[PDB]
């Protein structure tokens, strides 16, 4: 089978629309938080580059080579474990699946631009985190689906 | 010239990613959706359905026939004008062009899902509004680019 070939998920361009699916996601203040910082995370997660139409599980990616305009991903923080960073222009628009029950980031009232964080062990194991303020969507398991638009590398 | 044909902009399906461009937008207080409510608006505006790749100006869209899954938009009247409504799951992720200077909606800390409003006179004249809280991006002209994901009709 030889289908149509498009640009891969690991290749990101500044401006691409990112769709992440976080099934059975849980609330956290100990994984990516030293004192008291919030985010929703999920063991199994799917990341789609809506622009290309290409999609793949986080756990099934080689985050070592995930690039942004010919440059591997940045790593500002490392609270709890190693954290790959996918930056975005604006904030993260995420929601509780099916319902209009929307979610809001930690910097809910600042001109700060949110980023996506991914933990990777090096082989077949990955979690995806998305900034939050409180349990606006629940304690967990909570099926979430977020959306955003990549920004330029610092 | 007959190039490759895709699904139109006027036809929306709940889940489509919407990319809004509000070139040189202004801040507006008692002028949109409800009394004493903030939002950024643009005369000239471009709406792209990132999923299909189809895009067009707001002023060049027959909002009379803009549908969502075979159902015309829920046009709702405001204190003044009558407005067309494009609902979204989650919130609106908008930003000041180029910079990481992000924006935030009026319901910045609620599980409320934001919607896109368009005013249309009936022929060749259409503004696009996007919810805001204060002049986080400026007074205007301010070039904004927003993003979101279509929701189900009520």
């Amino acid at each position, epitope marked *: 089978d030889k289908p149509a070939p498009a640009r891969p998920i690991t290749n990101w361009r500044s401006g691409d629309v990112v769709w992440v699916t976080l099934p059975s996601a849980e*609330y956290a*203040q*100990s994984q990516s938080a030293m*004192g*008291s910082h919030p985010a929703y995370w999920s063991e199994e997660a799917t990341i789609i580059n809506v622009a290309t139409g290409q999609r793949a599980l986080v756990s099934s990616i080689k985050w070592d080579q995930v690039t942004l305009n010919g440059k591997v991903l940045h790593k500002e923080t490392h609270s709890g474990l190693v954290y790959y960073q996918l930056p975005l222009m604006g904030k993260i628009s995420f929601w509780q699946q099916g319902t209009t029950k929307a979610g809001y980031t930690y*910097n*809910y*009232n*600042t001109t700060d631009s949110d980023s996506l964080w991914v933990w990777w062990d090096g082989t077949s194991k990955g979690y995806l985190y998305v900034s939050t*303020y*409180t*349990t*606006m969507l*629940g*304690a967990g398991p909570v099926n979430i689906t977020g959306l955003g638009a990549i920004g330029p590398s610092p | 010239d007959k190039p490759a044909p895709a699904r139109p902009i006027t036809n929306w399906r709940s889940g489509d990613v919407v990319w809004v461009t509000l070139p040189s937008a202004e801040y507006a207080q008692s002028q949109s959706a409800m009394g004493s409510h903030p939002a950024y608006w643009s005369e000239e505006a471009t709406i792209i359905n990132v999923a299909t790749g189809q895009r067009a100006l707001v002023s060049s869209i027959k909002w009379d026939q803009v549908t969502l899954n075979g159902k015309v938009l829920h046009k709702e009247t405001h204190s003044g004008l009558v407005y067309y409504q494009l609902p979204l799951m989650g919130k609106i992720s908008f930003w000041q062009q180029g910079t990481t200077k992000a924006g935030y909606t009026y*319901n910045y*800390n*609620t*599980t*409320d899902s934001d919607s896109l409003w368009v005013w249309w006179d009936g022929t060749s004249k259409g503004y696009l509004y996007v919810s805001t809280y*204060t002049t986080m991006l400026g007074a205007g002209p301010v070039n904004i680019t927003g993003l979101g994901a279509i929701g189900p009709s009520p």
Partner: antibody
Amino acid sequence: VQLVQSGAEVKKPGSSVKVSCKASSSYVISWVRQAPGQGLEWMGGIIPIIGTANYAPKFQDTVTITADKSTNTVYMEMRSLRSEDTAVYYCASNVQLQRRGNWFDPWGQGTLVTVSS
Amino acid sequence: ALTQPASVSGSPGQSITISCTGTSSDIGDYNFVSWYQQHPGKAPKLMIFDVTNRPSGVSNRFSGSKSGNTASLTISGLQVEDEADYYCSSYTSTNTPVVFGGGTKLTVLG
């Protein structure tokens, strides 16, 4: 959501006492003491739906806040009491008809913690 | 604690501003400053939240503000039932989780 608090708790200098804070989704019941004359100083901030209490760095060694998930209630246990601990204490969630943020509202009636011999 | 004075007084037909200066990284960078009103022998009442916002019940007299590193409460058109303590509180995103003000005693001299 409405907050109801426990009555007066008069105790000896060196004992433990639990203060019940009843409520009427996502409520975050915190605690802010009131030293007479001096200004308010926050101490607790448990999230009943998660059950983890992350207290202020000055207290924590005497305040043990738990989360009763059965009847939506939060207890405050101020152990190792003294004349300095003799203060009016309030339980405070964050609410705004729909919003949730970095603030306090509504507040409890105020448990009178009179600690003296 | 937050750097907030207590000596605020004036005429009823005048406006006032209460300074609330915190760290350069927890006022100018992060904005979550909330204000309360303590009437004699009563539990605090929410007046302002997230720098600029009022609940449905607080009169339009109150107006929040953020001037770089100093936040201020603006009460224009003073009222006779406003003799109470006024506080400001930003959830500082540092080692200290929540920081309260000094408590401004409002005595509208009349």
